[PDB]
Amino acid sequence: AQNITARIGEPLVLKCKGAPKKPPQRLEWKLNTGRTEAWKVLSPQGGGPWDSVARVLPNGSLFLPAVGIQDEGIFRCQAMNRNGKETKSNYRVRVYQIPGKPEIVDSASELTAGVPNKVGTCVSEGSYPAGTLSWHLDGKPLVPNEKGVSVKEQTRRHPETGLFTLQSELMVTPARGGDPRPTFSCSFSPGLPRHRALRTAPIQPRVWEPV
């Protein structure tokens, strides 16, 4: 199977290899996605509730007006070139969605060296697939469980759109004598490299010293 990646809401056309360019054609599409209860067979004539979802074109290609999460899966076409030449087509479809620009909430105006502090919470909404959030300190990435650095992550899927909302709360134990004016930032990285990482506006808290 060849891997195909389409953006949610965008149209998708799957070619039927070895199919006659004009009707009538001897072919059948069989797909297994989130819409199909099992294997759904689509004929050149079609006819049903699938016509507004997935339709076979006059040239034999499968057409989806607007792909969705429900349309992820396997698409296979078995065509018959006149005779008895037969050609198979195998497609693996994955979809994606870019979230809005990540925002930092509950950010600390100031913080104290030597003790755990709540730096802030990064929030990303409307992404598929889920993806990951990652914090950065002055350009370099921060890693959990190392030197008082910890995160409190959670992922939540919207009941209707099926899109994901990410939340990452950063906590750091600043080194005494360290940088009094550190720069923090959160970045969103998608599952597949379909686009570049999305980074928050930086937060620049003050580091005060304990009495």
UniProtKB/Swiss-Prot annotation:
Please state what the protein is called.
Answer: Advanced glycosylation end product-specific receptor
**What post-translational events are described?**
Phosphorylated on its cytoplasmic domain by PKCzeta/PRKCZ upon ligand binding. Phosphorylated by ATM following DNA damage.
Gene expressing this chain: AGER
Q: What does this protein do?
A: Cell surface pattern recognition receptor that senses endogenous stress signals with a broad ligand repertoire including advanced glycation end products, S100 proteins, high-mobility group box 1 protein/HMGB1, amyloid beta/APP oligomers, nucleic acids, histones, phospholipids and glycosaminoglycans. Advanced glycosylation end products are nonenzymatically glycosylated proteins which accumulate in vascular tissue in aging and at an accelerated rate in diabetes.
Keyword Ligase listed? The answer is no
Q: Which residues of the full protein are shown?
A: 23 to 233 of 404
Q: Name one GO cellular component term.
A: fibrillar center
Would you list which residues are glycosylated?
N3, N59
The UniProt record describes its induction as:
Induced in T cells by antigen stimulation and by the S100B ligand. Induced in trophoblasts by DNA damage.
From which domain of life does this come? Answer: Eukaryota
Any single GO molecular-function term of the entry would be: advanced glycation end-product receptor activity
Gene source species: Homo sapiens
